Amino acid sequence: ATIHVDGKEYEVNGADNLLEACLSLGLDIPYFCWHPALGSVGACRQCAVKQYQNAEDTRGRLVMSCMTPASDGTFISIDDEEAKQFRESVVEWLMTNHPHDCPVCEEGGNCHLQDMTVMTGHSFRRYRFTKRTHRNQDLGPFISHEMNRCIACYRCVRYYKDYAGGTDLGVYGAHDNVYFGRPEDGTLESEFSGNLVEICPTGVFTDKTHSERYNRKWDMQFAPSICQQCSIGCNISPGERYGELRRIENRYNGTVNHYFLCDRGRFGYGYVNLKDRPRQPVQRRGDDFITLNAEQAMQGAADILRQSKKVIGIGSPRASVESNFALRELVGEENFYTGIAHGEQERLQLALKVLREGGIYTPALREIESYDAVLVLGEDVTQTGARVALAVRQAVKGKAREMAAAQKVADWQIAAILNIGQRAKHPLFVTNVDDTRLDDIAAWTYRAPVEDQARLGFAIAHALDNSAPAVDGIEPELQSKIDVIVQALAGAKKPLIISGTNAGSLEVIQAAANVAKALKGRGADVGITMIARSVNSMGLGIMGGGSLEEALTELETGRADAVVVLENDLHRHASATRVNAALAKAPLVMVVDHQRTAIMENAHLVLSAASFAESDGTVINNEGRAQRFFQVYDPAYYDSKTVMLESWRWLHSLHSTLLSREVDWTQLDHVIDAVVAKIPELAGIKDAAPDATFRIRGQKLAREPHRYSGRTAMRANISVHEPRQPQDIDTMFTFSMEGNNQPTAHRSQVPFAWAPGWNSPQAWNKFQDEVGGKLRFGDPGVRLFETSENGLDYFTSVPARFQPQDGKWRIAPYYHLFGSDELSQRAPVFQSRMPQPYIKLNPADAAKLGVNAGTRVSFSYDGNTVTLPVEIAEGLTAGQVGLPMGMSGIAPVLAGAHLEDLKEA
Amino acid sequence: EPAWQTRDHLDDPVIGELRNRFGPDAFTVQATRTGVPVVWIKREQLLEVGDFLKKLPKPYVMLFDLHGMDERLRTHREGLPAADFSVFYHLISIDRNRDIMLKVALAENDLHVPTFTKLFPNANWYERETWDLFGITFDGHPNLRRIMMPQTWKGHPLRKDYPARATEFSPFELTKAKQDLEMEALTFKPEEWGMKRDFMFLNLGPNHPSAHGAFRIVLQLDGEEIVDCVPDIGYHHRGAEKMGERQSWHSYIPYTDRIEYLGGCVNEMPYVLAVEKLAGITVPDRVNVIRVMLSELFRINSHLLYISTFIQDVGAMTPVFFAFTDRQKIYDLVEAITGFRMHPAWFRIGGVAHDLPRGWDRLLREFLDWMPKRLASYEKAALQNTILKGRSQGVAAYGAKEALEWGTTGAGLRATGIDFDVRKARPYSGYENFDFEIPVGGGVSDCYTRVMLKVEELRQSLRILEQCLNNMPEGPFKADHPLTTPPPKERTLQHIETLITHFLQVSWGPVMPANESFQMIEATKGINSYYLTSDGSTMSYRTRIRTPSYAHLQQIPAAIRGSLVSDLIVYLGSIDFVMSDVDR
Amino acid sequence: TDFLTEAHLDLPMEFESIGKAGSRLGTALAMAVDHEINMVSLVRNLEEFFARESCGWCTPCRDGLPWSVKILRALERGEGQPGDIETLEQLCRFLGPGKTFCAHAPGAVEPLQSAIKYFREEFEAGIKQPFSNTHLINGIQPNLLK
Ligand code: SF4
Ligand code: SF4
Ligand code: SF4
Ligand code: SF4
Ligand code: FES
Ligand SMILES: [Ca+2]
User: Residue B271 is part of which domain span?
Assistant: First the structure.
């Protein structure tokens, strides 16, 4: 299409509306109610331009550019005097009731309303009357509510309801008393409620966790990092100030997590700021804890390692690729053990084999929203991979999108799309041990044990393709529902099969692979998604090694006298008693970690590693994409006695001191090149980010904004002399403003979005080639593996039905978004949000034991009698007992595990 | 059409002459808010374009400015030739009362331009500074050596990839530079300094017991006569332009104060006028009158300092005490108005920081009654002394040709008989509404002639203050523009729109739309100009400051050659320079 | 619908005839106003209705009808200030068709602009106070704009 803006010709896409087309060209139109992800509704009337019928037209007409299609040969004007005066009048009308709140408002300096008030040039107030006020609600521990600052742009309700699928937020009231919130005080129920702080263009919804230790946006030090709280790998911008992590903002990745995080990623960063973290290396001498510097800790550790006869290394899926590789190099490939259980490692390896050998394309998180039918097998995605659940909701609304497109309704006119697609939606079939949070939009929900879910998947694969193995013992109504699933999936142009390793069953993953193969054989454009557990689970699976049980037997039999545990608490992957016995038997335990774990009581040496905020590295997400996270701040800048290094730096210097009796604090690119040379399956991680020599016209990339303040006074209480600026030899970023963050810079790693006149999160529009699309010059991250030409075979190992045996109790996993991730549990703000641990029981089983709802029962596993109060779960299958995974004492290795001595306390 | 409107200046006769001489495709005309025709010339045609402008019927006789620009990070270069770097040449035709900027584009690898020293002899120091701060080579330059940084300096500080902040201090570098200073006199080679050839060699500096700064002069002597002399400058280099690339538009005003520290608001004036050109701000008349008031008060302060310093350099010691009492009276008024003495930082984008305090007219009337009897006493006690006249008259004289070819402005140029004052030729800040004369010399610029012209300028500034006191407008002290930084304080404190504008203007900075502006003013020591490039951001993309003391110090060897050393001291005392103005 | 005077009483009750007169036929149920009724009070009641019956979806109606309501309340009590009638006219021209989301706000501003057009002396009689948006803050000299 061709448009003429202010007499200048432009070539745009005709399917877009005028506002997004003009913002993609760099033109500045003020706007409030439109969002690139939510569509156009034409409420705020801020985006007004003047449209003319032809070139020889002088009068024109004011139109909303967000609601005007960018048709071919469209003549408009933004800088028309009438349009400018109307946009100024809209800003003024918004400003009549706005509170005098900017100094004491957390959105100041990050406010879209401030930016558009300045952009319209409106700075004189001629309104002399009273301003309306509102009471505020309590929205829980995460979101702070300030209703006075609202401009009634309806972004919150549209996002939270039409996009996120939440139910408890809404718009109440009338003419100019419109209220946006919950009907009563209470916590926002959605797992994606945290994106309201970026969706809201004003200070109504604010980050309460940030509002505790508040600082303005110009005062933050930012870095482009990857969220470490599950395997999705959403791009984040951690921002720090005064040596502590202050905020997690969304970082735009048009291929992964474009505008939206989940609440675990956004608010579960509080473990970084804990005061019990290791900040110096500590050596045990009898009962004494001697604090060492880097050099003497490395010398003593390498000497004791040299006197040892066999050193084993226990990695972790929390650690980066470089740190796991450095441990593998230090202890040797044959002595390296992945720090996960044998069943967990088997499920992880099977998921990786399906992803990179099954011949079926695995979509990115953004690409999930374009699929026509979704089958989720055994994976509670809302609690384990939440952004996948959000993308599944978008893919479900794709049917309403297609129905509206059949009636020649444009894709940005969201109200008409929702009107045409009333309740018609794409087929969604979820299977779990109980009800999921996707049940409100699911076409069918199957509450069954993991064997029965696997048998359902194998039956679906057999009915789609008769070459697949059959299932014997299917009930006729279950067969009818299976047939419903089969005709829904076979009629889909782009079916999607989602599973993962959190189900605790190998057969569920095998059944999902069988369904995907059966759909691939029919010619469908099938995609497969596997949800892992931790941030670098796929990286640890690609690296390979032994299981944690093998390392425990190596420690117990005395074949290994030295163990180096990297970023692993060892209690989430094995029993605590056996781990404690093996670590007490081992004469040398060296724990390289950044969190105070329980295994440092018996550890001979504790190396104060860096977390993601204080380190660089690479992580492989659930779809096999290598992503580089960068260090946010130097921990030794404010506390000069802090020796907190990267884990790969610790292990590489330990290897160098073990070999040549000399420390070597290496560079990140050297470890990256070592990974690429030694492990060819991880050769793609070289291209995740450019090396430390990367420059933009000769200068580095800035971590902090141009107006970063207090540089001669933040450390003046320690010493009036300004310290040396921390040098960054590992990466292309600098710990200063002396760098580049231009939106037109040829790069893909963007620490934060800021353009002049756009201080809000809306500056990501300036950082994209087209708004709502990809990052300009490509999104960061590279897929490690391509789709194989030939797939796997059908898995003939069809499990039997779940048999409830007396005495035994099958543990059904119950994951929680706030409580299943270890570091997220360590965050103090999650302690109020996380629920009290309830053991879930069937009504029939609770009647059999005679226990009611709320009474405490005690059960023993691995000789550990623990007590929990009972919650009645009707959707659970009899013979199963539900356990909340990741919680206090309930390790996630209990999925699929049997249970003994379930008795009332 | 306001004065700040973006003009292309295609109706200038110089554009038609250039088109008729070199053809229509030989150059590109850029539309700016600088007020001058900006013409991008090809590099190979630069010397003939400069010669053609020098041979015009009313020629461009003065090279006003010559400096570089790093355009690698400039995003809004629409209609501009492709350039990793550029070099601009600002030329002034006094007879036409016009000026033209010529810009030469340069690639990143091919950073060399033909030298301009043959057409204009004052291009030498400008090309040395452009090489020093940008790495731009000038082919045919006699001694292309560093002029601000020491010779053992790596990198070019005004480039975009150069880190602006201070490096970590090291005693090793201080000890090495002390050893270099100690062995400098032992291993002095008069070939790297641009000199040639009983010829004594002496160093005047680097420390100097005077009030104009501390700088070093290498003197070649035949007995008492000065055969050759080059100045070693850059000892007072504060990196003010690089700070222009690091501050916001509003928070850079205190840095503009300290360019020449005897001027204050006189130094603030061209910067805020250029920023108001970038912002599209037409300030009201009371703002113009207040800014003229403060500029003339600081002009009287600076001229009293200059006359006292000259008299003390001659040898009389008492008038400096008396004129410092007069400076105390001026400082009392300035302290009452702005709150500070010599770096007020009171001018704002769109106006001034506060209104005039109630009672300022009493202090102005007291100073206006105090000044003239004291000035007459200074004249009759020192300026009419025949010993002072013998020490001053005939010392370092030059005509209009030497003043034009060296870029000499201010009292020296007008002492050569050229009636070129910025306040009359190219009026700014409502200077047309004041009745004042421009004193001129007979055609020869002595030390004594320059000093008496500064005395007459002081009297004319007293006349301006009298007219301003008798006719004071009532109105706003800030413009009503949305880009007036900061907004008026009471509206900020009780209106949310004004609070939002204030919040974003003081924190992130005011957003100047992408343009280029230029303001030239008649400062206390000559012509002071600000050339501002905005890339659409809250910071300046380029802040070029042309100061007159640089040009006067470059004119120093061409006027004192063949004279004595006491004549050199008197000439230094009568130039009206400060080393901060030289190095900035 | 817009107010019409007695000169427009000899007009046929058709859509096109009332359209060229500067009004709408509407529901063709006419309402007559005599000399006893102050037009400022009547238009204030009309605008209070139209501002309380807003749906709150779109900015100009939702935040500009209450401003006109408060201005008309000030004109009713004689507390009007200069710029108020100019504000009403700006509201009338900035709440027309296309500017707002639906047709409630053009129909709201039609009687206001018609009453200003035909009975401006009644609106000008409510302006009795000088314009004052700021109060003096001690220690801060105001910017005395002209
Ligand atoms: S929401 Fe924005 S405009 Fe409103 S008080 Fe906060 S910073 Fe100011
Ligand atoms: S609360 Fe925020 S997002 Fe919701 S309508 Fe108000 S300004 Fe918009
Ligand atoms: S979905 Fe996973 S990776 Fe993304 S923000 Fe949530 S916890 Fe982090
Ligand atoms: S003009 Fe219509 S859509 Fe807009 S707020 Fe008023 S009643 Fe609602
Ligand atoms: S952005 Fe178009 S009316 Fe709100
Ligand atoms: Ca680092």
Answer: 240-583
Q: For residue B251, how many other CB atoms are within 10 A of its CB?
A: 17
Q: Which domain holds residue C114?
A: 39-125
Closest CA to A623 of A500, A705, A486: A500
CATH number of domain containing B63: 3.30.460.80
A365: tokens are 């998180």
User: Hey, how many other C-beta atoms are within 10 angstroms of the C-beta on A676?
Assistant: 15
Cβ–Cβ under 8 Å, residues B443 and B416: yes
Which of B139, B163, B185 terminates a domain? The answer is B139
Residues of C in contact with A126 (CB under 8 A): 83, 87, 133
Give me the phi and psi of A434, to 5 degrees please: -150, -165
Instruction: Give the separation between CA A490 and CA A524, rounded to whole angstroms.
Output: 8
Token pair of A20 as six digits: 């997004």
Contacts of A231 (CB under 8 A, 6+ apart): A385, A531, A532, A533, A534, A535, A537, A538, A621, A622
List the beta bridge partners of residue B137: B112
CA of A665 to the centre of ligand 6 (A): 11
Q: Is A687 helix (H, G, I), strand (E, B) or coil?
A: helix
Residue A46: closest C-alpha in chain C = C59
Give the closest-approach CA distance of C132 to chain B in angstroms: 12
User: How far apart, in Å, are the Cα atoms of C7 and each of B501, C10, C11?
Assistant: 50, 7, 9
Residue type at position A559: R
Of C140, C144, C146, the CB nearest to B489: C140
Q: Is A902 in the pocket of ligand 2 (CB under 6 A)?
A: no
Tokens at A206, concatenated: 């604010």
Closest residue by Cα to atom 4, ligand 3, is A234
Let me know whether B110 and B253 are in one domain: no
DSSP 8-state class, residue A709: -
**Residue A726, token pair as written in the block:** 């921390």
In sequence order, the 6+-apart residues with CB closer than 8 A to the CB of C36 are: none
Give kind and range of the element (H or E) at residue A788: none
Phi, psi (5° rounding) for residue A198?
-105, -25
The residues facing A871 across adjacent strands are: A840
Q: Is residue B152 part of a domain?
A: no
For residues C84 and B508, give the distance between their C-alpha atoms in angstroms, rounded to a whole number: 35
Breaks (C-N over 2.5 A) in chain C follow: none
Tokens matching residue C108: 């709201």
The resolution in Å comes to 2.7
Q: Which of B139, B155, B187 is the last residue of a domain?
A: B139
Structure tokens at B576: 């009206």
> B380 lies in a domain?
yes
CA distance A594 to A450: 35
Distance (Å, whole) CA B510 – CA B485: 7
CATH code of domain A810-904: 2.40.40.20
Q: Which two tokens stand for residue B224?
A: 């008492």
* Residue B25, strand partner residues: none
For residue B565, tell me if it sits in a domain: yes
Tell which residue, B115, B45, B60, has the closest CA to residue B90. B60
CA-CA distance, A624 to A621, in Å (whole number)? 5
Residue B225 domain flag: no
Helix/strand/coil for B128: helix
Q: Which chains neighbour C (Cβ–Cβ under 8 Å, 3 or more pairs)?
A: A, B
CATH number, domain of C81, equals 1.20.1440.230
Whether the CB-CB separation of A19 and A29 falls below 8 Å is answered with yes
The tokens describing B387, both together, are: 């010993």
**Please, are residues A517 and A361 in contact by the beta-carbon 8 Å criterion?**
no
CA distance B429 to chain C (A): 19
- Please name the method used to determine this structure: cryo-EM
Contact (Cβ atoms closer than 8 angstroms) between residue A402 and residue A417: no
CA dist A181 and A138 (Å) reads 9
Q: Please tell me whether residue B273 adopts helix, strand or coil conformation.
A: helix
The whole-angstrom separation of Cα B67 and Cα B90 is 9
